[PDB]
Design a binder for this molecule. Structure first.
Ligand SMILES: CNc1cc(Nc2cccn(-c3ncccc3F)c2=O)nc2c(C(=O)N[C@@H]3C[C@@H]3F)cnn12
Length: 261
């Protein structure tokens, strides 16, 4: 049921460690095709079920195209080792970047990024395909857009190991990006989008970050509302996305409409 390119280990060179993802270590690399800069996502030693969930993500990303979705080149297998080969994006994860640049990222810059992320998720909605890991960490900054007469440009990363295969402990760690219906469909990405807008508004500090797993879990079980930004028109949008009833979240047609005025 899955389709993606098999990458020969001879085709790839591993360079410096960039950090950890869910069950992964991410490295700068080279792919010989020309010697293309890429990232290598090396899966932890894993049960077959996690390996499958990894391949499922490679299959998903290999059959979609959008200018605000990161490219997946394929999967390298090296006996028990699984390596996803994906797009290197120049300025790296947005959450890190916003925390580093805190105090000089204008609202207009943030509204461009919200619009680009909405155009990626509008495309996935129309395809009826779930990302399931929309968050600042998975938004990659291709163009800075701070210089006068420039605009930023983002790429949404592959979601990594499918949410469906992760432990309850890992799902609780992803609150408040995790849709509440996923604690125990594309509607989950509407919640994830809303949480990511708060994260962007708060310069890479998402709500409930300091809170213990039990306190994050109770927040959802009690259906506490997440904070609203002081921009009332953006607050209306985030509050509609962060609605507990999945069927009450707005379409990406409505979201894009609201962001473009
Ligand atoms: C410059 N290019 C680049 C850098 C980078 N860096 C990181 C990858 C993973 C973790 N951390 C990371 N570690 C520890 C603390 C904070 C972090 F952000 C990193 O800094 N990641 C990527 C990716 C990519 O797809 N990354 C996957 C989605 C995760 F970020 C594509 N380009 N690129």
């Amino acid at each position: 049921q899955l389709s993606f390119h098999r990458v020969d280990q001879k085709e790839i060179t591993q360079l410096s460690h960039l950090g950890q993802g869910t069950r992964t270590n991410v490295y700068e690399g080279r792919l010989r095709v020309q010697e293309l800069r890429v990232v290598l996502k090396v899966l932890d030693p894993s049960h077959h079920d996690i390996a499958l969930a990894f391949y499922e993500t490679a299959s998903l990303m290999s059959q979609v195209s959008h200018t605000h979705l990161a490219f997946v080149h394929g999967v390298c297998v090296r006996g028990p080792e699984n390596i996803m080969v994906t797009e290197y994006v120049e300025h790296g994860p947005l959450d890190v970047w916003l925390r580093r640049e805190r105090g000089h990222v204008p609202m207009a810059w943030k509204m461009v990024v919200a619009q680009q992320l909405a155009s990626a998720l509008s495309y996935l909605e129309n395809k009826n395909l779930v990302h399931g890991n929309v968050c600042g960490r998975n938004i990659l900054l291709a163009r800075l857009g701070l210089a006068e007469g420039t605009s930023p440009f983002i790429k949404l990363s592959d979601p990594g190991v499918g949410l469906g295969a992760l432990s309850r402990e890992e799902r609780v760690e992803r609150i408040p990006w995790l849709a509440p219906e996923c604690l125990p469909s594309t509607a989950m990405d509407k919640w994830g989008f809303g949480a990511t807008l708060l994260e962007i508004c708060f310069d890479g500090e998402a709500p409930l970050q300091s809170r213990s797993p039990s306190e994050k879990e109770h927040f959802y079980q009690r259906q506490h509302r997440l904070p609203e930004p002081s921009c009332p028109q953006l607050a209306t949008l985030t509050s509609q996305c962060l609605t507990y009833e999945p069927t009450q979240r707005p379409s990406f047609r409505t979201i894009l409409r609201d962001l473009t005025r």
